[model samples]
Target: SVKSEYAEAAAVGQEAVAVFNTMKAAFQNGDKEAVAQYLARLASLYTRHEELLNRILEKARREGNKEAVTLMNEFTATFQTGKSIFNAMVAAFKNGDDDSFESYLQALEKVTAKGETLADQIAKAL
Candidate 1:
């Protein structure tokens, strides 16, 4: 099945969670260089809309993508939500808003949860 892409994107969410922990540890350790790496890595990950979305379905210009329409749509919105909150999370962490950082992270976990559900559904749709 062409479902590999969904699994791949599912891993993307997990991978962000992975990077976040390191970015977190680096920040806590005051390792500016390593912190920058994870931050930039996360930035690139979120910024890659085409790589993360469009390629999930190949052989499409107009209609091939129409197959998994709503799943992709919701998945897209979910990631957008997480990405915005990720910025907020970064800001809160840097500014020492511990409670807010926790809040953002908790909210992001929800997004990733929803995202994975959709991704898994999309994968099985194949």
Candidate 2:
């Protein structure tokens, strides 16, 4: 049986996936402003998520449990992809040239695709 906290993580993982889907649609529809907003939000989200997962891992260590530790490891590993994409977008937008904008759109395509993969992976984990 899964721990309550693990179950909660699964739920959160599911929510993350739903949010990613919305982000994907926003990108595919060529909503540049929405894409920009969502991408920027993603950077914040992933950074916070990574930190929270790390904290969970640390607490798991203190308590000497494996379940939370496992959950944290899985979550952190999968979610790091998001952080990388978010960082790339942040850099792309910061450059602010037309070429940069094109590159950013391409990067958004790639990153959002990865996010779809992430949602699947997270679902499998749950």
Candidate 3:
């Protein structure tokens, strides 16, 4: 059950990556209308990922697996660390801060990679 829930959360994480790539593609093509639309989709996927992760952590606590709990905490923390970066990334891209946007985007990409590894660690903790 935890595995499925975590998988769902991870699925959203990947979906966000796809959305971002499409968003970038739209930008490259000067598809202004499509780009912002994908940006909004990113937020939606991020929200869903948060919801699924919350379930995963809650189960960790209720089950009293201290090791798993700790892993879940870090799992949550990694994404929590990512939340502001996601928001900031959009903020920069939405305005004239292209330089800052690129910075945030790279940071966000790094966080996602880190988050995925942490997810694997959580699974191993079992």
Candidate 4:
């Protein structure tokens, strides 16, 4: 059961990574429509990832895994921040505000850096 829990978490983590990678590529490719679509999809993915993280957090608490719990909590917080930024970015895109969109991208990059570290910790803990 524990092994499967880790496996599930890993799978989910990989999915998130894949989405981010594709989103980055979309941006680089200068496809506005694709970037918008990817951003929306990424937001939904994060919502689903949060649900899974909550379950993992509960199990970690039951198992007395302090590191896992801490890492998960950190990741959750970071994810929420990124989600907010992503949503704002989408809003900016819809409004055709290049300035706001660029600013949001910068904000997301900062949050994403922290998220990357937290994600690594959580993966190692699991």
lDDT of 1 at 86: 88
Tens-digit per-residue lDDT, 5-121, candidate 3: 777777887898899888877866777688778889989998998898888888988888799889888878888888899899788867957678778877887887877777888
- Model 3 Cα shift for residue 34 (angstroms): 2.0
- Return the TM-score for each candidate structure: 0.71, 0.56, 0.87, 0.77
Candidate 4 structure quality by residue, lDDT tens digits, 14-125 = 6866876787777667788898778777777777767777888888889999988887887787778887888898898888887897798888878877677666677678
Candidate 4, pairs of clashing residues:
none
Runs with alpha carbons beyond 4 Å of true place in candidate 4: 1-7, 24-30
Task: For residue 111, give model 4's deviation from the true position in Å.
Answer: 1.3
lDDT for model 4: 0.77
Task: Point out the worst 10-residue segment of candidate 4 by lDDT.
Answer: 1-10
Tens digit of per-residue lDDT, candidate 1, span 1-126 = 346665666677567678888877786676767876887888776666436676664423244656476667666677778889989987876787878977887787787776666777777654
Off by over 4 Å in 1: 1-8, 25-36, 57-61, 64-67
* Ranked candidates, highest lDDT first: 3, 4, 1, 2
In each prediction, how many residue pairs overlap at the backbone (N, C-alpha, C within less than 3 A)?
Answer: 0, 0, 0, 0
Ranking by TM-score: 3, 4, 1, 2
Compare candidates 3 and 4 on lDDT and give the better one.
3
Q: Quantify all predictions' global Cα lDDT against the true fold.
A: 0.70, 0.57, 0.81, 0.77
Q: In model 2, what lDDT does residue 80 have?
A: 66
